[PDB]
Amino acid sequence: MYKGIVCPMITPLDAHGNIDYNATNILIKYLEGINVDYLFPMGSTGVFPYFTLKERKDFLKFVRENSKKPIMAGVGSSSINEVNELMKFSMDIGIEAAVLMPPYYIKLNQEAIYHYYKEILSSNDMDLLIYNIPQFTNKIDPETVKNLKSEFSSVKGVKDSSADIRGFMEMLSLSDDDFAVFQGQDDLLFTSLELGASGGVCGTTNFSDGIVRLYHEYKNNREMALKIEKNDVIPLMKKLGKYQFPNAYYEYFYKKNNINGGYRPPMYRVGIEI
Amino acid sequence: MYKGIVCPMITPLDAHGNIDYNATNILIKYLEGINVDYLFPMGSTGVFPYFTLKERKDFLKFVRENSKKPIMAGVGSSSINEVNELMKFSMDIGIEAAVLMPPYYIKLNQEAIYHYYKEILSSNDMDLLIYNIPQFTNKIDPETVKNLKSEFSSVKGVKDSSADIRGFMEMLSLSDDDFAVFQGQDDLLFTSLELGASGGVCGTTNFSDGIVRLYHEYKNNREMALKIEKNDVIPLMKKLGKYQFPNAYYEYFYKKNNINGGYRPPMYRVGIEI
Amino acid sequence: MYKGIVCPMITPLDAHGNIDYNATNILIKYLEGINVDYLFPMGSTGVFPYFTLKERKDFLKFVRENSKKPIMAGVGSSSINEVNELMKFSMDIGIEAAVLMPPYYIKLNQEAIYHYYKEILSSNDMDLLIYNIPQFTNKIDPETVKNLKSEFSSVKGVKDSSADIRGFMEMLSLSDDDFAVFQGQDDLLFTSLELGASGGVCGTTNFSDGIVRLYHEYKNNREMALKIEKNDVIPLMKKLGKYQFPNAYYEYFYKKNNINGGYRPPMYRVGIEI
Amino acid sequence: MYKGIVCPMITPLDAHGNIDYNATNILIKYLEGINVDYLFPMGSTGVFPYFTLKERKDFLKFVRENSKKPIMAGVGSSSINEVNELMKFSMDIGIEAAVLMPPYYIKLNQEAIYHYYKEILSSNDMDLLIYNIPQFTNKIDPETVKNLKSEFSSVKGVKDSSADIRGFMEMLSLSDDDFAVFQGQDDLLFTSLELGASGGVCGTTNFSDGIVRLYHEYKNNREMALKIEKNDVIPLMKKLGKYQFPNAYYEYFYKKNNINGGYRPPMYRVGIEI
């Protein structure tokens, strides 16, 4: 079962906008500390498309050689060659699963998205999680997920960051013992678990245990989970949302740890407070 | 310095969906034949994000070596490291101009987009054209274009594929001797020349010469130019627009030249008639 | 204190698309039978803007005169004059509450919307529930509702059909003992109750008791309410949503009571399988 | 035979937000005194849906009785009874043409919109121009305009405010000797006339002759006319667009004629200079 809590890791940067591996190690330590169940390097929160194929390869290598935690590697790209390359390399260095969103830039219908996933999943074998994030890329309909699910046992779940609860409940309908469904919006996790979500992919866990507390409080303590959602998580999200995504996550991390972290353009420091 | 007709080149593919350097030749001599003024490899029509940095570097090298008409290289990428490397390569091999659209995937405000163009232009000399294509990426406001223009003399103009006439007229206000303004929708070229456009970047020129005949006819025969727009270009855009962009553009160039051309996912064959 | 199940009544029509007051009675007696708590004539479901001011006054009278259920009168209109008239009229015939959404057609910011509710609330003491349905009219921000809340005690709640769960939780943050928050989408009722909603405004109650069982079951058997939602309401809501709103609701009502009912253009007969 | 410049009259108000028939006469005279070709009362600029059926009737009667200019009556309403009533009324008192945009509030597909126009054009006889304004209501496709045109000889043309040049060109393709096509955006008049537009419906003519000068200078000196579009109409439209539509057109009329005019909420004074 894929389930529990995934941290879409930031990619901590030094002051020249390059990968800070000491800070990455600091982050991994913190995540192990609060007991996330998976590491998710090079997601949206880790801003994978600002990095080169090389840097992403380098960063994936480091994260696996510095934690024994199971890793869902972000293998996103609009180039099928980059996705396959990144997937082979993740498989060849012991990363447990891949995370993939639809290709972006050019707007696509479902047949186009379907064909792309088909090619990738027949060229591959590792556990893949489909990732619907229609704010940054073409949407993948639940039906398209369903059909990809049928043809490929390699597909082990879907992650949804839509914030569309109706869309989410469609994805949930695809849930069974070998298909997880993850909520990618921290403030919607509690509600999602009630609807039977496998868990959440939550970026606040880069610097707060709130989401993990909520989740290990859930099975026993409904109202406590909700309290932690309503009082700690939602306000934190509301504060992060005032800012151009994702630079406030970086600043929060840099401050909580007293690091001189930097920003690769188009990132910039936004001036958030704790 | 910058004026006339630009071909946003298709990037011909073999049946495996990898670059067809022979069709590229067929295509180059076709574009020299009908007399487009500039070659623009790796734009949206060339589906640049589907290729790796390597592939895109090779294709730029090849177009350079195989033609004498001036080149605008598409150096687009949400990764700043990739843009700089693509502009450096382009300069060093004698490509006249770089084309650059705002970063994509993550939604960006105007300060982020500006911080990005600024860090890039601060470390580069070559003639650069800004590219507003808000359908596929974050929009860049005319004012942002203006502010960049004052700060960097190497910005040589701006291209707009928005099809928003009011917006286009705003971009036109920035026009002067050292700042061209190009229309990126073939069907609007006529309306745009009448408002003071330096010209068009028109994908139809990959297998048709309507847009060129239109442009040279324009100077002392407007209603001939309008006729060609109304009778030839606009219908051809109607047939093309029925299909997933840009696939019909490929299948059509393929039919015209009798090429066993292929499709790289998420591209797929559409079934257009010639 | 407002809470429980609100039926946003259809306005039954004869074969000539005029109000069928006999069917309206058939409906009122069905609503009483399944024990909804409030009748809401001339909401969106009741396609109120298709009717004249005179037809609307007349319908509120009929409903008020053929049921002792507490009534929330849809007093919607972009004309502040029609609202005052409709509210004055429904106060004078003993309708308990008014329901008002923001003005439509012309796009409005929050100052215009505020001033419009301001002028109106200053002239009508009666109980009013603000109605937020951004699909059909200008959205009213949570902040704007908060402001009006404190400035007029007459505002007794807010109804939200946006289907935006984050937005709904903002509205719920305004919840208290003299301020209700209703979920307007039937499939979202269970989630909304879990989060503290005062109840639902649910169109399916026009011909289905599903929503009402759900609300009453929720008290002692939580999982049972959820089952009703998933097997009954949600699958019904999917059927109804395959068609242009709200026509399917009308057919479904017509077929169930074997009534020969009609459709005032732009309404039209659809085909639902009941 | 429908051709030239139409004023979408404001409906001037007194300080209490009711119709000022003295100021309305001031307006009519002014419009006669810049030789606009038609008067269009109760279009969007006249904010027709903020008025009662009875006020609207009284206002059309007044404009009929107080000018020999041909009139196009705004007959807009989502209620088909109000449209039949306003149309029958306009023809009875000798208004030449009716103007009708699609019904609003509820989202309508094209079939709903068709059955609605069909019914109305089946029941009324007078000259009728279809009004496409997708910002404030459901869009009506060219194909739908087209079909109606063929079914009903009383459909005399179309007016379009979308600001979508491609879409407007599609509407122009339907043009013929008894099917006029008007450009609704003042700043887009020049571009629209080149493409063959019958004329323009222009709210800046409530208080400025710029559009009327433009249209008469055109036929005989295009470049004199485009200078007007650039130095007079467009900058005026820039200023007016700073504000919540259509309030600034009201303030502007009020200041020019020194009239103590008002605002019916949700209208409000916006504070605009000269």
Name the DSSP class of C258.
Answer: T
D chain contacts of residue B187, beta-carbon cutoff 8 Å: 166, 169
CA of C47: which chain D residue's CA is closest? D106
CB contact under 8 A, D165 and B165: yes
> Which 3 state secondary structure label does DSSP give C174?
coil
CA distance B264 to A262: 36
**Catalytic residue from among A139, A149, A156, A159:** A159
**Cβ distance C236 to C203 under 8 Å?**
no
Give the angle D198-D166-A78 at the CA atoms, nearest 5°: 175
Q: Write out the two tokens for D39.
A: 């008067």
C chain contacts of residue D81, beta-carbon cutoff 8 Å: 51-52, 55
CA of D76: which chain C residue's CA is closest? C105
Please enumerate in sequence order all residues whose Cβ is within 8 A of that of B213, keeping only pairs 6 or more positions apart, or say none.
B228
Cβ neighbours around A28 below 10 Å, total: 20
Interface residue C165 vs chain A (CB under 8 A): yes
Catalytic site residue B219?
Answer: no
Nearest to D248 by CA among D201, D192, D208, D210: D208
Q: Write out the two tokens for D32.
A: 């006669």
Nearest to C99 by CA among C119, C66, C77: C77
Interface residue A105 vs chain B (CB under 8 A): yes
| CA dihedral sign of residues C50, D134, D54, C123 | positive
CB contact under 8 A, B187 and D166: yes
The CA R_g of chain A, rounded to the nearest whole Å, is: 17
Judge if the upstream peptide bond of residue B266 is cis by omega within 30 degrees of 0.
yes
CB contact under 8 A, B268 and A244: no
Counting CB pairs under 8 A, whether chains C and B reach 3 or more, is no
Interhelix angle D165-172/D142-151, nearest 10 degrees = 20
CB contact under 8 A, D103 and C78: no
**Cβ distance C217 to C266 under 8 Å?**
no
CA of A226: which chain C residue's CA is closest? C195
Interface residue A91 vs chain C (CB under 8 A): no
Nearest to B112 by CA among B149, B86, B80, B90: B80
Interface residue B47 vs chain A (CB under 8 A): yes
CB contact under 8 A, B165 and D191: yes
Counting CB pairs under 8 A, whether chains A and D reach 3 or more, is no
Q: Write out the two tokens for C98.
A: 């008014």
Please enumerate in sequence order all residues whose Cβ is within 8 A of that of B78, keeping only pairs 6 or more positions apart, or say none.
A49, A50, A266, B103, B104, B105, B106
First to last CA, chain B: 36
Name the DSSP class of B271.
Answer: -
CA of C196: which chain A residue's CA is closest? A226
Question: What is the residue type of D116?
Answer: Y
Mutating which of D169, D218, D223 best tests the B interface, going by the most B Cβ atoms within 10 A? D169
Q: Write out the two tokens for B26.
A: 């067929």
Q: Is C132 annotated as a binding residue?
A: yes
CA distance A229 to A224: 8
CA distance B86 to B75: 6
CA distance C19 to C41: 12
**Cβ distance B100 to B128 under 8 Å?**
yes
CA distance C129 to B182: 52
Q: Report the run of H or E that residue D65 belongs to, with start and end.
A: helix D53-65
Interface residue D174 vs chain B (CB under 8 A): no
Length of chain A: 274
First to last CA, chain C: 35
**Cβ distance C50 to D80 under 8 Å?**
yes
Nearest to B113 by CA among B150, B144, B155: B144
| Neighbouring chains to C with at least 3 Cβ pairs closer than 8 Å | A, D
CA distance C272 to B221: 59
CA distance D241 to D73: 25
CA distance D36 to D4: 8
CA distance B50 to B18: 10
B chain contacts of residue A120, beta-carbon cutoff 8 Å: 265
**Catalytic residue from among D3, D159, D219, D230:** D159
Cβ neighbours around B220 below 10 Å, total: 8
Question: What is the residue type of D53?
Answer: L
CA distance C245 to B235: 35
Interface residue A188 vs chain C (CB under 8 A): yes
CA distance C104 to C47: 14
Q: Is C34 annotated as a binding residue?
A: no
Q: Write out the two tokens for A121.
A: 């999943």
Q: What is the 3-state secondary structure (H, E, C) of C178-226?
A: CEEEEECCHHHHHHHHHCCCCEEECHHHHCCCHHHHHHHHCCCCHHHHH
| Neighbouring chains to B with at least 3 Cβ pairs closer than 8 Å | A, D
The separation between CA C166 and the C-alpha centre of its own chain, rounded to angstroms, equals 21
| Cβ burial C48-68 (10 Å sphere, 16+ → b, else e) | bbbbebebbbebbeebbebbe
Range of the domain at A42: 1-274
- Tell me which residues of chain A, numbers 204 to 243, contact chain C at a CB-CB cutoff of 8 Å: 234
| CA dihedral sign of residues B73, B76, B79, B80 | positive
**Sheet-wide strand order for A180-183:** A38-40, A4-8, A199-201, A180-183, A155-160, A127-132, A97-100, A72-74
CB contact under 8 A, D163 and B165: yes
Interface residue B21 vs chain A (CB under 8 A): no
Q: Report the run of H or E that residue B201 belongs to, with start and end.
A: strand B199-201
Name the DSSP class of D230.
Answer: I
C chain contacts of residue D265, beta-carbon cutoff 8 Å: 80, 112, 115-116, 118-120
Experimental method: X-ray
**Cβ distance B266 to A112 under 8 Å?**
yes
CB contact under 8 A, C164 and A169: no
| CA dihedral sign of residues D184, D188, D190, D192 | negative
Interhelix angle A53-64/A21-33, nearest 10 degrees = 40
Interhelix angle B110-121/B142-151, nearest 10 degrees = 30
CA distance A215 to A198: 10
CB contact under 8 A, D266 and C51: no
CB contact under 8 A, D103 and C245: no
**Cβ distance A79 to B50 under 8 Å?**
yes
Resolution in angstroms comes to: 2.5
**Catalytic residue from among B159, B227, B238, B239:** B159
**Cβ distance A61 to A93 under 8 Å?**
yes
Number of domains in chain C: 1
Give the angle A136-A142-A143 at the CA atoms, nearest 5°: 130
Q: What is the 3-state secondary structure (H, E, C) of B108-145?
A: CCHHHHHHHHHHHHCCCCCEEEEEECCCCCCCCCHHHH
Mutating which of A51, A53, A79 best tests the B interface, going by the most B Cβ atoms within 10 A? A79
Cβ neighbours around A81 below 10 Å, total: 17
CATH number at residue C201: 3.20.20.70
Q: Helix-strand-coil percent breakdown of chain B, rounded to 5?
A: 45, 15, 40
Q: Is D122 annotated as a binding residue?
A: no
Nearest to B119 by CA among A232, C227, A17: A17
Give the angle A103-A104-A105 at the CA atoms, nearest 5°: 145
D chain contacts of residue C116, beta-carbon cutoff 8 Å: 265-266
CB contact under 8 A, D50 and C119: no
Q: Write out the two tokens for C30.
A: 């069905």
CB contact under 8 A, A47 and B106: yes
Out of A165, A187, A188, the one facing C188 most closely (by C-beta) is A165
**Cβ distance B40 to B71 under 8 Å?**
yes
Interface residue D123 vs chain C (CB under 8 A): no
CA distance C140 to C110: 7
CA of D167: which chain B residue's CA is closest? B163
CB contact under 8 A, D195 and B191: yes
- Chain A and chain C share a number of CB contacts under 8 A equal to 28
Place of tokens 């879990």: C194
**Cβ distance D131 to D100 under 8 Å?**
yes
Counting CB pairs under 8 A, whether chains D and B reach 3 or more, is yes
Interface residue C194 vs chain A (CB under 8 A): yes
CB contact under 8 A, B166 and D163: yes
CA dihedral B161, B163, B164, B170 (to 10 degrees): 50
Q: Is B45 annotated as a binding residue?
A: yes
Q: Is B192 annotated as a binding residue?
A: no
**Cβ distance C46 to C12 under 8 Å?**
no
The separation between CA C201 and the C-alpha centre of its own chain, rounded to angstroms, equals 5
